[PDB]
A paper describes a structure:
Initial attempts to crystallize wild-type MtGlu5 failed. Instead, the inactive mutant E393Q (dubbed iMtGlu5) was first crystallized in a suitable form for structure determination. The CDs of two iMtGlu5 molecules were correctly located in the monoclinic P21 unit cell. The initial map showed some density outside the CD regions, and amino-acid residues corresponding to the CBM were manually placed, followed by computational refinement and new map calculations. Notably, the inserted CBM is not a fixed attachment, as its orientation varies with respect to the CD in the monoclinic and tetragonal crystals of iMtGlu5 and MtGlu5. The CBMs of the two iMtGlu5 molecules differ by a rigid-body rotation of 22.5°, and they differ from that of wild-type MtGlu5 by rotations of 25.3° and 10.8°. While large-scale conformational changes are often observed in enzymes upon substrate binding, the moderate flexibility of CBM in MtGlu5 probably allows switching between different orientations of polysaccharide chains. Because the CMC titrant and its molar concentration of binding sites are unknown, the n value was modified to 1 together with adjusting the concentration of the titrant. The data show that iMtGlu5 has a strong affinity for the recognition of long single polysaccharide chains with K d = 5.71 × 10−6.
Author numbering: 15 to 452
């Protein structure tokens, strides 16, 4: 055949049947599967269903951890409805609180679950894909090597009965592309690498009721909006930090407040930090956590440059802090420029939203090309609390960059809160669907 590259290409455009079998039981989170869903998805031009399945509530707590035959039968049914409509289907292990909380303790039960799944579907055609663990987090975030070791063990279990089926594997940080460099894979030739994409979280998860506190809404997304460079998260504290038009406004609202960008990936090869403020600002500059900061005072409209060796001297720059050098709050100012400099080409930390999407997909593609692995972006979507035009813009921009890079993908999700199909009106949410299938 064509190998794993062709299997990934055949994944093509896909959609998640979410809020369904990955809840503790089907319908617990609002979506019960129906046969007509598969037909609608096929008719809308998707080639693939991703089927999130949380198995732990359906398996014995004691060895041999047998999965409920009725639940297994429901997964059988979904596999059948996909296949009979000419769709691919990705079967995963999705939510698994116990495993993320204690990988070592829960390992045997998880591996038994995978052995049951792999043996049960061993004779399915190449249109059926396995996905070892959705979004590893918890202890896996603390020690990524736990996930590297576990995924290798689970892969060996799967390969005992499925010697060549495509197996989808992602990094920790909830399948964050920024943690790809911590992922380590065995030399198995039939692996597809996955990441999920929700940047910027302030927009895609605005109004998320599952968080405490609930993030604010009314966040708009536009290609030309200001943004931080891809992968630099706003970890600021004690401050109002935000783009207003072309300007990054910083209000230090308390003593020692900090403007703080953090990257899970980090960067190498820079030796200086350059920035410019609209007013003279007295700062503590730090580019390495728990390292000594350097005191600097800028002047309005005039660039200041600081050698990284003098404010923490990191080898891999992951944390960048401009801290209010004062026990009191400070009036708002504009950060007009912020860029890293080195022997090579500078890194502008301030950019625009569209370019941030492109930068993220370029980073993933560089990883995938270096490691010679195909890429499937198994989840991306913007929550319904955002205004629809912004969601359409974001969704189409993301899908476009994905396909420009020949990433296969699966939108989150078919129905419910990220949904593209309105089950009440029994109609597609047309502009969002068109963002995915133009």
């Amino acid at each position: 055949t064509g190998g794993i590259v062709e299997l990934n290409r055949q994944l093509g455009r896909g959609v998640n049947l979410g809020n369904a079998l990955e809840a503790p039981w089907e319908g617990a989170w609002g979506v019960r599967l129906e046969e007509g869903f598969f037909e609608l998805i096929r008719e809308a031009g998707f080639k693939t269903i991703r089927l999130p399945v949380s198995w732990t509530h359906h398996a014995g707590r004691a060895a041999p951890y047998t999965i409920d035959p009725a639940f297994f039968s429901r997964v059988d049914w979904a596999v059948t409805q996909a296949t009979r409509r000419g769709l691919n289907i990705v079967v995963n292990v999705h939510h698994y609180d116990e495993l993320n909380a204690n990988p070592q303790a829960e390992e045997a039960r998880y591996l038994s679950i995978w052995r049951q799944i792999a043996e049960r579907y061993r004779n399915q055609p190449g249109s059926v894909y396995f996905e070892l663990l959705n979004e590893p987090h918890g202890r896996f975030n603390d020690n990524p090597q736990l996930w590297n070791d576990l995924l290798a063990k689970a892969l060996r279990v799967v390969r005992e009965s499925n010697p060549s089926r495509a197996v989808i594997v992602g990094p920790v940080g909830w399948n964050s592309l920024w943690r790809l460099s911590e992922l380590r894979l065995p030399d198995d030739p039939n692996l597809i690498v996955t990441f999920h994409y929700y940047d910027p979280l302030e927009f895609t998860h605005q109004g998320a009721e599952w968080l405490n506190p609930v993030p604010p809404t009314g966040v708009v997304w536009r290609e030309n909006q200001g943004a931080f460079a891809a992968g630099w998260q706003n970890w600021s504290w004690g401050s109002r930090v935000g783009f207003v038009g072309e300007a990054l406004e910083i209000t230090y609202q308390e003593g020692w407040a900090g403007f703080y960008l953090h990257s899970d990936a980090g960067v190498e090869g820079y030796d200086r930090l350059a920035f410019r403020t609209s007013a003279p600002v007295s700062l503590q500059v730090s580019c390495r956590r728990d390292a000594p900061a350097k005191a600097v005072t800028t002047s309005g409209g005039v660039e200041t440059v600081v050698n990284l060796s003098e404010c923490g001297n990191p080898s891999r720059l992951t944390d960048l802090i401009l801290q209010n050098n004062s026990p009191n709050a400070r009036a708002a100012f504009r950060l007009e420029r912020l860029e890293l400099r080195g022997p090579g080409s500078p890194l502008a930390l301030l950019t625009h939203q569209q370019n941030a999407i492109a930068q993220a997909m370029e980073f993933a593609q560089r990883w995938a090309e270096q490691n010679r692995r195909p890429i499937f972006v198994g989840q991306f979507g913007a929550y319904e609390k955002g205004d629809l035009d912004s969601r359409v813009r974001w969704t189409g921009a993301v899908r476009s960059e994905l396909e420009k890079r020949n990433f296969s993908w699966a939108y989150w999700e078919f129905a419910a809160g990220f949904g593209i199909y309105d089950r009440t009106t029994r109609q597609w949410r047309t502009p969002l669907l068109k963002a995915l299938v133009p």
